[PDB]
A = this chain, B = another copy of it.
């Protein structure tokens, strides 16, 4: 469904049938609520505990097809542009793509073959570095986030006497906002995520109805406006 259909069925589901009908929502408000509902839905469906099914990214066909249009593959750029201080002397710093929402798969291609990057926790890092070896298992590499400015910088730890040729990252692209109409105005240009032009929902049509329902629920919680509704509907932001 295109943006006009988002807005028309938003109006239908919000106030065109309600008995003591409420004021219609302005297009900026509808775009804001739709973008919020989109992000909430993405976060709810990525995490199993966030939805009533207990199903995350790839726990069912529907969850695969939900994020299928939001998956992207890119590469981390070696961060030798400027000097820096790494926590580990034997780690190579890489910069992830700017439009990164969530990392789901990483791999590094070295001279000793491809290796799956395992994101190790800080307590896990301490445990592993208290051991005599201090290097990954055969077909794996280690990873920790380092000092990041304006984009995520990442330290890749591989086994000794190994060089990294490329660093691929299969991630979830940051969703683009849903903007119903050109938000340009003479009184001031308002933006949802830095863009005023019309922006279609760049995800699969399977969850457009879900985004619409969530947006309507958020609109009605805003209309109710007491602390109660804000608190319970803020639980699903996550």
Binding site for B on A (CB under 8 A): 1-2, 4-5, 8-9, 12-13, 15-22, 25, 28-29, 32-33, 36, 39-40, 43, 46-47, 49-50, 52-53, 57-62, 64-65, 67-69, 71-75, 85-87, 89, 100-105, 107, 109, 113-114, 116, 118-119, 121-122, 124-126, 129-132, 134, 137-140, 144-149, 152, 168, 170, 174, 187-188, 190-194, 204-206, 209-210, 213-214, 216-217, 219-227, 229-231, 233-235, 237-238
Q: Within the oligomer, what is the number of copies of this chain?
A: 4
Given contacts A61-B102, A65-B101, contact A205 B122 (CB under 8 A): no
A-B contacts, 16 of them at CB < 8 A, read A5-B194, A15-B225, A17-B29, A19-B225, A43-B62, A46-B61, A61-B103, A64-B103, A64-B145, A73-B86, A74-B85, A75-B85, A89-B109, A105-B125, A210-B237, A216-B234
